[PDB]
Symmetry: C4
Subunit: 388 residues, 4 copies
Amino acid sequence: AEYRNWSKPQCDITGFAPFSKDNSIRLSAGGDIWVTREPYVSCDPDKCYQFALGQGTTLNNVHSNNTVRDRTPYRTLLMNELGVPFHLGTKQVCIAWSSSSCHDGKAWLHVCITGDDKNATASFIYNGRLVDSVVSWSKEILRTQESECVCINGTCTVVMTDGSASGKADTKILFIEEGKIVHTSTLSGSAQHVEECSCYPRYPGVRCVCRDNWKGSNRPIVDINIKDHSIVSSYVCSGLVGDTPRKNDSSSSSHCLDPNNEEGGHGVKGWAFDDGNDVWMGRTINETSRLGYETFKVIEGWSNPKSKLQINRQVIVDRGNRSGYSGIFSVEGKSCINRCFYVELIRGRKEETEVLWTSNSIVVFCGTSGTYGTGSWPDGADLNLMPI
Amino acid sequence: AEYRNWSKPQCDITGFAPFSKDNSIRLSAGGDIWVTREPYVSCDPDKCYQFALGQGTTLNNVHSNNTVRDRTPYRTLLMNELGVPFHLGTKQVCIAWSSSSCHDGKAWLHVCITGDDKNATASFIYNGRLVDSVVSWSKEILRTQESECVCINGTCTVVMTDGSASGKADTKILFIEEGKIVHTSTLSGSAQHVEECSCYPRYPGVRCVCRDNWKGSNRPIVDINIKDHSIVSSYVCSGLVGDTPRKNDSSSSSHCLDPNNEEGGHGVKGWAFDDGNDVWMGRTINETSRLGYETFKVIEGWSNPKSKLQINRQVIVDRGNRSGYSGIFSVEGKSCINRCFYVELIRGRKEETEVLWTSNSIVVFCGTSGTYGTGSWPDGADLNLMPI
Amino acid sequence: AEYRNWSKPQCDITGFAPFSKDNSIRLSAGGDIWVTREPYVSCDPDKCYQFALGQGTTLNNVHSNNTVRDRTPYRTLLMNELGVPFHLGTKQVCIAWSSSSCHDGKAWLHVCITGDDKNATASFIYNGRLVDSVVSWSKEILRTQESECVCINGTCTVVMTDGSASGKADTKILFIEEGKIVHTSTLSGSAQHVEECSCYPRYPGVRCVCRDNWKGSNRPIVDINIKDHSIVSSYVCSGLVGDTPRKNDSSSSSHCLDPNNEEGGHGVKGWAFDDGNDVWMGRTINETSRLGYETFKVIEGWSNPKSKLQINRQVIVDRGNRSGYSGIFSVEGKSCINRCFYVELIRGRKEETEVLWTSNSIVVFCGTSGTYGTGSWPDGADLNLMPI
Amino acid sequence: AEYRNWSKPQCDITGFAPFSKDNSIRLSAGGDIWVTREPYVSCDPDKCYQFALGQGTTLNNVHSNNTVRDRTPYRTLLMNELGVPFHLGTKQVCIAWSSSSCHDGKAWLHVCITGDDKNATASFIYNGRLVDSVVSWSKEILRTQESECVCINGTCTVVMTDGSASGKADTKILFIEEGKIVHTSTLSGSAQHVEECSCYPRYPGVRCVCRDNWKGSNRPIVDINIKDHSIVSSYVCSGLVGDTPRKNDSSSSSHCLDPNNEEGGHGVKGWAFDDGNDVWMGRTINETSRLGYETFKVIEGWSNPKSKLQINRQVIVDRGNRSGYSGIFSVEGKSCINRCFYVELIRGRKEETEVLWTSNSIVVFCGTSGTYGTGSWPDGADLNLMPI
Ligand SMILES: *[C@@H]1O[C@H](CO)[C@@H](O[C@@H]2O[C@H](CO)[C@@H](O[C@@H]3O[C@H](CO[C@H]4O[C@H](CO)[C@@H](O)[C@H](O)[C@@H]4O)[C@@H](O)[C@H](O[C@H]4O[C@H](CO)[C@@H](O)[C@H](O)[C@@H]4O)[C@@H]3O)[C@H](O)[C@H]2NC(C)=O)[C@H](O)[C@H]1NC(C)=O
Ligand SMILES: *[C@@H]1O[C@H](CO)[C@@H](O[C@@H]2O[C@H](CO)[C@@H](O[C@@H]3O[C@H](CO[C@H]4O[C@H](CO)[C@@H](O)[C@H](O)[C@@H]4O)[C@@H](O)[C@H](O[C@H]4O[C@H](CO)[C@@H](O)[C@H](O)[C@@H]4O)[C@@H]3O)[C@H](O)[C@H]2NC(C)=O)[C@H](O)[C@H]1NC(C)=O
Ligand SMILES: *[C@@H]1O[C@H](CO)[C@@H](O[C@@H]2O[C@H](CO)[C@@H](O[C@@H]3O[C@H](CO[C@H]4O[C@H](CO)[C@@H](O)[C@H](O)[C@@H]4O)[C@@H](O)[C@H](O[C@H]4O[C@H](CO)[C@@H](O)[C@H](O)[C@@H]4O)[C@@H]3O)[C@H](O)[C@H]2NC(C)=O)[C@H](O)[C@H]1NC(C)=O
Ligand SMILES: *[C@@H]1O[C@H](CO)[C@@H](O[C@@H]2O[C@H](CO)[C@@H](O[C@@H]3O[C@H](CO[C@H]4O[C@H](CO)[C@@H](O)[C@H](O)[C@@H]4O)[C@@H](O)[C@H](O[C@H]4O[C@H](CO)[C@@H](O)[C@H](O)[C@@H]4O)[C@@H]3O)[C@H](O)[C@H]2NC(C)=O)[C@H](O)[C@H]1NC(C)=O
Ligand SMILES: *[C@@H]1O[C@H](CO)[C@@H](O)[C@H](O)[C@H]1NC(C)=O
Ligand SMILES: *[C@@H]1O[C@H](CO)[C@@H](O)[C@H](O)[C@H]1NC(C)=O
Ligand SMILES: *[C@@H]1O[C@H](CO)[C@@H](O)[C@H](O)[C@H]1NC(C)=O
Ligand SMILES: *[C@@H]1O[C@H](CO)[C@@H](O)[C@H](O)[C@H]1NC(C)=O
Ligand SMILES: *[C@@H]1O[C@H](CO)[C@@H](O)[C@H](O)[C@H]1NC(C)=O
Ligand SMILES: *[C@@H]1O[C@H](CO)[C@@H](O)[C@H](O)[C@H]1NC(C)=O
Ligand SMILES: *[C@@H]1O[C@H](CO)[C@@H](O)[C@H](O)[C@H]1NC(C)=O
Ligand SMILES: *[C@@H]1O[C@H](CO)[C@@H](O)[C@H](O)[C@H]1NC(C)=O
Ligand SMILES: [Ca+2]
Ligand SMILES: [Ca+2]
Ligand SMILES: [Ca+2]
Ligand SMILES: [Ca+2]
Ligand SMILES: [Ca+2]
Ligand SMILES: [Ca+2]
């Protein structure tokens, strides 16, 4: 086995094609399925895995009451092969209420954060054994991506944030070789508030598209030099912005270096990536809440903060159906690196009151250079009929 | 690992021997089993897999109401090892309400069709990663085999139909190398309406025996040249015809080049294959509905449209018990290529009203050059006692 | 991978040591466990598998009513790794109401018999593909071992019986190379009625200890020359006899060449093997029914029909708890071939009336040259409390 | 594959980092989970396994009544991959009410003890086959570690005790090469009462930290020379003692060679290991019962019986939540041997009366040379709401 370098061109992308769905909530109506949130997909050199943060319970289970909560001692990172729903035989790969995973071409890395809100611990688990850990630096919910980290030449990188949700915080990018934290660079450049980075290889570096929870409805960008550890940061230029909340299409504005200051507070995890000077991104369709999910190409939307010229719109989930977190992952082809995305379909509290629990299913798409049609892939669970 | 060429003679066939049954519906009476239809078997160079189109639900599950429906967003292709019933730990290999799979000797191909009836998308997934997709060409339920595709020298072929069920439609045969659509040939020769081809290697080409849903109770044949991409087409000569509906044995007639125009409208998925100038086929015993299932050898039935001389009849499922789709698959022996078949045993709506759901189990047989006896392998589920 | 020859000495045996138990019936009280009977253990060169004949249902399942019946269309051979209870994810390896399996060192053989009582079919499945089949020869429940076949130099042998349970029948020993029936020898020598042979390698041949269902409470022996296909047969000399029913210890008698004519009618599957001129065997403790299970060494009990000198008694299952079929299997050590046995613990009908079903669990022991103690390993299920 | 020598330095340890949790009891509230006690973790050269002694039942199961009992015929050793909860598809690797497992670098050894209290049998199972067994020597609950054995150069060692719980007993250390008992050394040196040793490699020997159930609240130490089979024994010097019960921190005293005679009677399984002349250990926080669980480094606590200078305290489980057995396991890194521990979280009888059963979940930590924070990882099951 060799290390993944990802030293290949990004694939031709004309839009995205259907790839997986787990129907997890519909299945949990007549089966033992884990209660989850904050899921993601990541793949070894052969095949993909779906991950999620469990609530240490199944759904048709008295313990599923109040799974609205973000951090308990019972949250673990569940890891299955993609499209195998989180059944009772699913492996919990670490204790974690925040996490991120990747494969360097030789073995898995899991970055797992649990413990006290004011003093959480990040364990680093590579090749099925604990190799390192770090404390919270700022003592206020040490957290990371909730999607795949990225490894190049065997150096894995991961964005972690400690401190305020709605003010300045302390973001650090760690570098990991065989599970060992070998360097820490701190957040630098013009990105002001960084979370939950959806990151992807982009030889010779990594690139991340994050969530500003403070002043921006534009998403931050972070560029990571793997070799000398340098960090630059900015925002997705594109005049059509990717966070939720945001202002509508006619009212919105962005900026390449600064938060737009537009409904900025709060956010949702999301993704985007560069296509020359164009940008592919997706987002919730509804501008205030996590209902619906679309993707498009903004032309010059990677280098022109004034551009609102989208093309290749696809509805992934229609505007009446619920979405949630979404993130990028990258899959090496024969000649090129393709780009894929998953989308958390959240059901339950607080939005839905028919049931006491909070879970999610996923649906997953992949970049295609072929043709494709139209549709809608929502959760499909009828909450009026689920475990009373 | 090398590519499958299948450059071996077809095995001596004196009839078929029992091979698998999953008892899926009986199991679903006290366990969590997926609701399925449109199943098939296909095998890698070591071992076989059962596939089916799930309804994104298990049976003892409120979501199993109305699984009569043919296409929802929740349908995925389930893939298990043959004889492992579709339990909750079963892997969903793509989103699909129409599908077809094969192994080229190196890796799996899945052809998966989902999305809008008028604009469905066909994703092509090879070696656990999406490589291509195509849109509907005619905008009316893009669909494919519901049984294994066939790959020779690493070029996989698959029949896909778009357009009318009960008039002319646009059938295309695609060619796929490592998940990449490398050519499309359109349907040619004298076959008028083509569906759900049960296809099998026949070095140097592929051969398919399809379903005419329009004017024929004889089944179409399609011959696919893998090397220069040419396509010829006709009908199964044999005077005893293989579709359902059909006219009875004394009243029936066929034709080698044309639909018999005999109760032709509608049909059911089925299979047949040549044995010199003889033909092996199977079919439902009842001539109007999917009750019972038999197989036989019509002598000169591959080259003489007047022949009604059958021998080696076997009842697979008796005439009081329900059948459904059936299709061929092919298994490489030490010296020869054997031929096998599965048979969908459909239970539930609309025919059976004791329950609100629609599922199936399977039973599977294989060509044998040995001797064999007699029996009946129905579904065995007592619907009077199942999830009320 | 090479072929198993088993060209090693039988291990020193001072008695048997505990090896596995599946608690299948106790588990089925709060889980989805298959209804089974006629189980056995067999092992590949690495590890062991438990097999059983399923009733195409789980226990807490309406379909478990009447699983007393010996042959239905829904019976399949279940195969798990040893000590993994027959859960819903268990693989059904063929359709079978009678079966036998072995590994030649390269791949599995399954011998599977299903279909009409008067015209049953025996499929031969090797390396995950059907290679041969035979019809019933005598048209009266073609049946085989219900325990492992034995393969030497890649020629597997299996005893099959067709015809009368309580008169002369037609026993044949088949020889199989890569799933192909390459020869059939018919039953020869002085054994009059042969069933359900518990067979074991004994270089250069195989040896079997069977069930006489007609005139003998002594068990038959069958010797199989793998190279020239010759067959001799007799009975276990030992004056303490191994069938059930039988006469008590003081009243009993045997004979090396002839059925003892002692309560002979009927029987139960069992095992024994030679240790020089001594014999190891086990049997039910109760002499008329399948309650309890013991093992011992009869000294000179392999060559002297008058000897009733037992030593090294072990209770495997105490005389108040239910037993059932038991059979031998053989496990290659570094220097020697060890001998092991499983014991069917039958629960349910007709003997137990608290429930409508009929199943079994297993317990398994292995030959040891060490020391060992005493105990009792019954089924442990409280049928007064099970699925009403 | 080569033999594990463990000829590497013990890793830098600054405390312990989170590693796994199975939430087994919370899961058993809406799923089929085994009833267990006496669990442990052990790892092959790639990955870790959780083990436990099952009660031959699942929790939501009538058979879970009275699982308070220590030895029944239905207890088997369950083995899963670490963090896969003991679901119904879990493999029972032997019959055992006392056990211990290890991997020599080539294959697993299981040491399994079942049968009569006064005449129990210890089976030794290596590479999926029984190789040896021994009887009870003293005829009073032959028992072993309930945590991993240790293998060096392919000689595995294991501590076993027979005889009195609250007086002198007969402890022996066995040596096993490929499952074969090749020598037995008896307990020697100044350790008076030995149980349930938590053992760990320490090249060139093994070292164990045990439970004195008679006169000591200090834990015994046993040193095992693998090459010449010699045995020395003593007690953990450290003035803060590791058993439960014990006297409080201000009242307590220890002794390097003798039981402290301090509330000594009874005990709980535990672990410790040397760090130069310092000692790492953990223990229950409550001094009389198995509520809470902490770990610390006593400075000079390995060579000075007067030292009560602890540093690097971590709460693993807070003082209101239940603990239980805990034990060490060892994981080979690239350059060093790390040390990890699991902790049995016991729920049910006799302490908790809301339910009739007795089970446990686990939580697992690992030595880290990094930094770490604070938290609490209890069982989390609400017994007021569980299977009535
Ligand atoms: C079958 O499926 C395919 C693929 O999904 C559909 O084709 C796509 O249709 C979408 C939506 O209409 C297209 O996305 C849109 O691109 C527009 C670009 O304008 C024109 O420019 C191109 C070339 O430059 C011309 O060839 C063409 O005439 C375009 O019209 C944007 O203006 C759109 O944005 C606006 O409309 C959307 C959606 O309605 C609004 O929500 C936005 O906020 C905004 O106002 C949009 O992005 C897409 O490019 C097409 N894809 C491809 C590959 O062709 C078929 O429409 C579909 N068929 C059926 C029957 O459903
Ligand atoms: C045990 O199991 C075996 C195998 O299943 C059975 O043997 C088969 O029996 C079937 C059904 O009778 C045979 O199939 C039939 O072939 C007929 C051919 O006619 C004769 O020609 C051959 C040689 O040319 C002669 O040797 C022989 O005498 C044949 O009679 C066809 O005429 C049949 O078609 C007609 O009958 C069927 C079924 O009854 C109708 O439904 C049809 O519509 C049609 O009118 C039929 O196809 C088969 O060939 C036999 N197989 C083998 C390998 O021999 C045994 O019968 C069975 N035994 C018991 C006791 O059940
Ligand atoms: C702990 O566990 C061990 C192993 O299970 C037990 O030791 C075994 O005990 C059994 C049962 O008593 C022994 O089996 C018996 O062998 C007898 C042979 O007679 C003597 O011959 C030898 C040497 O030739 C002498 O050393 C010895 O004194 C023997 O007594 C047979 O006569 C027995 O058959 C009769 O008794 C049985 C059982 O009671 C009846 O049911 C039979 O029908 C018959 O009348 C019997 O086969 C066995 O050999 C011992 N094994 C070993 C390895 O020593 C311990 O007894 C046990 N301890 C406790 C406390 O339970
Ligand atoms: C975030 O998480 C980290 C790691 O868990 C915490 O830091 C640890 O805090 C614990 C508990 O206070 C420390 O353990 C203690 O060590 C003491 C040593 O005394 C001093 O000596 C060192 C150097 O020699 C000085 O640097 C330092 O000032 C120490 O104070 C012992 O005295 C303690 O034992 C006593 O206190 C405990 C716990 O309160 C009692 O229960 C005992 O019975 C006993 O009386 C104790 O062992 C530990 O060393 C720290 N670890 C590290 C790596 O620094 C942070 O406290 C935490 N932050 C928050 C906000 O929760
Ligand atoms: C669910 O949790 C809430 C918050 O603790 C609690 O008040 C409520 O009683 C719980 N609901 C049920 C049905 O137990
Ligand atoms: C967005 O979601 C809100 C919240 O329910 C809803 O009321 C509103 O109609 C939605 N807005 C749009 C523009 O679809
Ligand atoms: C099942 O679905 C039908 C069609 O929508 C609906 O009318 C009916 O109420 C459903 N049945 C039940 C029991 O909910
Ligand atoms: C075919 O099926 C129909 C539909 O129920 C039934 O009424 C009829 O009797 C069957 N016909 C034959 C010839 O068996
Ligand atoms: C079980 O089967 C018997 C035999 O057919 C039948 O008479 C009886 O009604 C069945 N029992 C139940 C409870 O359905
Ligand atoms: C054997 O079993 C029968 C059947 O129940 C029982 O009545 C009898 O007591 C048993 N006999 C012996 C000798 O244990
Ligand atoms: C549980 O076991 C105890 C001890 O045998 C018994 O007395 C009691 O009846 C059992 N409880 C139930 C609910 O059956
Ligand atoms: C220890 O546990 C006992 C048993 O319930 C409890 O009563 C006591 O308060 C605990 N002691 C301490 C010091 O926490
Ligand atoms: Ca924001
Ligand atoms: Ca259930
Ligand atoms: Ca038709
Ligand atoms: Ca008999
Ligand atoms: Ca249940
Ligand atoms: Ca003590």
